[PDB]
């Protein structure tokens, strides 16, 4: 179980690094104790093994799966192109767009952890508990995933 | 129809929609459908997906210049087993000389299995199928769907 969790963290951070460097927008939500089946059902079902390659291919711009969220559950990619609720929080930086508001929005009604890559800057952020943690390095994201 | 038959129809619809989209856009593709001869040895050379089929995922896999696009997708029933898989290259002299590695790999796997492989040419957008060592070129959408339904 521990080896599997580490393999999944490595797959995620490799995909995030690829997308950050190319400023490919991405939205990846990891289900925790709050069930997210209602959101999973809005997307395209995958129930796929995690790999950095599949995560990258999903988010390539102008492709069927790239808009909306990937939702991971039980160490698999449950679905892609999923709807998440947009936060109305007035405390999100006004320079950020829909992916960030969707990530904060799901984080207000679940215990999930969501990773966002900005298409404008390639900056990486995480939404949890209604807050957005901006300006993350790879080491910082890894620390969050291991804590989670 | 039974659930198995309905699932088969959904899988055929997903495949044909994806192939049609890729053909129109000259997106090269190589898609092998396992039949009664097991293809585990080739599946194991790729990136494991074990994913539910959708036209959307098939398209996303083959987008040029992406991690998953080079090599074969291998399907088992209603699942995409793996992407970026190796297939053996045919040496058949009945492969049109202008065709490249995707068509030769398709004919190659068809010589050692009963699988059906679909190819989209990145040069012309033409759609072909390899089966039992033969390549059938320039298929219409209707002809592909009928071949899949018969398979
Ligand atoms: C200057 C920073 N920009 C270009 C390098 C984007 C940030 O670069 C990364 C941030 C986070 C991860 N990470 O969380 O894995 C990977 C790359
Ligand atoms: Mg876009
Ligand atoms: Mg002809």
CB within 8 Å: B50 and A52: no
- C-beta neighbour count of B64 within 10 angstroms: 12
> Structure resolution in Å?
1.3
Stretch (H or E) spanning A75: none
Coil vs helix vs strand at B84: strand
A47 contact residues in B (CB cutoff 8 A): 50-52
Residue A93 corresponds to which tokens in the numbers above?
Answer: 């930086």
Question: Which residues neighbour B24 within 8 Å (Cβ) at sequence distance 6 or greater?
Answer: B125
In the 8-state DSSP scheme, what is residue A6?
A: H
Nearest-angstrom CA–CA distance, A19 and A119: 9
CATH number for region B3-150? 3.40.1700.10
Q: What is the spatial distance between Cα B12 and Cα A94, in angstroms, rounded to a whole number?
A: 45
Structure tokens at B116: 């059906």
Tokens matching residue A8: 């999944």
B73: closest CA among B88, B63, B61?
A: B61
Using a 6 Å cutoff on CB, does residue A57 contact ligand 1?
no
Instruction: Provide the edge-to-edge strand list for the sheet that holds A69-73.
Output: A44-49, A76-82, A69-73, A26-30, A113-117, A124-128, A131-133
Which residues in chain B are followed by a discontinuity, with C-to-N distance exceeding 2.5 angstroms?
none
How far is B146 from B143, CA to CA, in rounded Å? 5
The CA distance from B2 to B37, in Å, is: 24
Distance between CA atoms of residues A45 and A43, nearest Å: 6
Reference A34, options A71, A81, A79, A87; nearest CA is A71
At how many degrees (to 10) do helices B55-62 and B3-25 cross? 40
Q: What angle do CA A67, B21, B71 make, to 5 degrees?
A: 85
Quote the CA–CA distance of B150 and B129 in Å, as a whole number: 13
Place of tokens 């199928």: B129
Distance from C-alpha of B36 to C-alpha of B122, rounded to nearest angstrom: 29
H or E segment at A96? none
Q: Does domain A2-147 have CATH number 3.40.1700.10?
A: yes
Residue nearest to atom 2 of ligand 1 (CA): A123
| Structure determination method | X-ray
């Amino acid at each position: 179980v521990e080896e599997a969790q580490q393999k999944t963290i490595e797959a995620i951070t490799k995909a995030i690094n690829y997308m950050a460097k190319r400023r490919i927008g991405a939205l990846l939500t990891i289900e925790r104790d709050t069930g997210m089946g209602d959101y999973i059902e809005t997307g395209i079902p995958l129930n796929a093994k995690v790999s950095s390659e599949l995560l990258i291919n999903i988010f390539i711009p102008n492709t069927p799966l790239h808009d909306g969220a990937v939702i991971m559950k039980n160490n698999e990619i449950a679905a892609a192109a999923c709807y998440l609720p947009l936060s109305e929080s007035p405390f999100i930086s006004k320079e950020l767009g829909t992916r960030h508001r969707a990530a904060v929005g799901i984080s207000e009604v679940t215990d999930s952890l969501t990773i966002i890559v900005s298409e404008e800057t390639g900056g990486v952020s995480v939404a949890k508990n209604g807050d957005l943690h901006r300006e993350l390095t790879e080491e910082a994201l890894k620390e969050m995933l291991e804590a989670e």
